Amino acid sequence: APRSVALFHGIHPLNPKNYKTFSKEFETILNNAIEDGDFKGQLTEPCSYALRGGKYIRPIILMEIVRACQLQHSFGAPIYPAEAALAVEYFHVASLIIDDMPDTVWARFGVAKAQMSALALTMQGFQNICRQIDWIKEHCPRFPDPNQLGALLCTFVSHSLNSAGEKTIPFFKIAFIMGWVLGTGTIEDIGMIERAAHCFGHAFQLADDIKDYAKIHGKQKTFDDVAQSLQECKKILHGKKIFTSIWNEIFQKVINVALGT
């Protein structure tokens, strides 16, 4: 596993942190991760262009799931999922690069470099997956069978990546499931977490479609779908004790999207 020089500093792993702090933390993680050697070659500029600035919400989901689960039980030195959250945003951003293709990513650099970049981000996302496993192996000796669980994570992210054409759901599935097994070597209720991620990604996509006196409803029907899926997701969350105070901020951000606020 090729190594870096530094990623994060002054981090309290299990502290209860709000979305903004989590966001600032992941931005420092992402920026530091560029520099220490991830995107070498002529595609150094493309990726950096694409990733810099964003909602970062999928990696944030990952990280909060892990920190919350680690509160419950620990395996010797709390797990702060950085390389894995990196990988989450990598996959999701590569999807975006591909979606914009025939300003944009392919505008400033060319469609050729655009797809070359997308492949680079997916590739080194898996590479940082393996890197997170290696970090776990060094600092977490009690962690249950890291090799098998890491292979299973790669397998699920695999199956999800090819099952994209909605297309917004699978990346949230990646975030949730990865954060679930990395917060705890469980695979005890992964399907429940699948329905949780699915409901949440559904509500997110619908809120995004709704984003702006035509009798066109206010598509109050679609809002009912959004809030119903959000309810069921919260039900699973508080059904596994990881429904923290972040999820309040997150749910209301989603809702305020659909409300025009």
Author numbering: 31 to 132, 144 to 206, 215 to 261, 270 to 318
The authors write:
Previous studies have confirmed that the B318L protein encoded by the ASFV represents a new member of the viral PT family, according to sequence alignment and a follow-up enzymatic assay. These experiments have shown that the B318L protein catalyzes the condensation of isopentenyl diphosphate (IPP) with allylic diphosphates to produce C20-geranylgeranyl diphosphate (GGPP) and longer chain prenyl diphosphates. Taken together, these experiments indicate that B318L is an essential gene for viral replication.
For crystallization, the N-terminal putative transmembrane region (residues 1–30) was truncated. Thus, the truncated form of B318L (residues 31–318) was expressed in E. coli. In this study, taking advantage of an accurate model predicted from AF2, the crystal structure of the B318L protein was successfully solved by MR at 3.2 Å. The overall structure of B318L adopts a canonical all-helix fold and contains 11 helices (A to K) which can be divided into three layers. In the middle layer, there are helices C, D, F, I, and K. The conserved Asp-rich motifs FARM (residues 129–135) and SARM (residues 257–261) are located at helices D and I, respectively. The remaining helices G, H, and J, surrounding the catalytic core, form the back layer. The most significant difference is the various conformations of their N-terminal extensions, where the N-terminus of B318L starts with a long loop, whereas helices are observed in the N-terminus of other GGPPS. Since the experimental structure inherently belongs to the apo form of the B318L protein, its protein-ligand contact area is much closer to the apo templates.
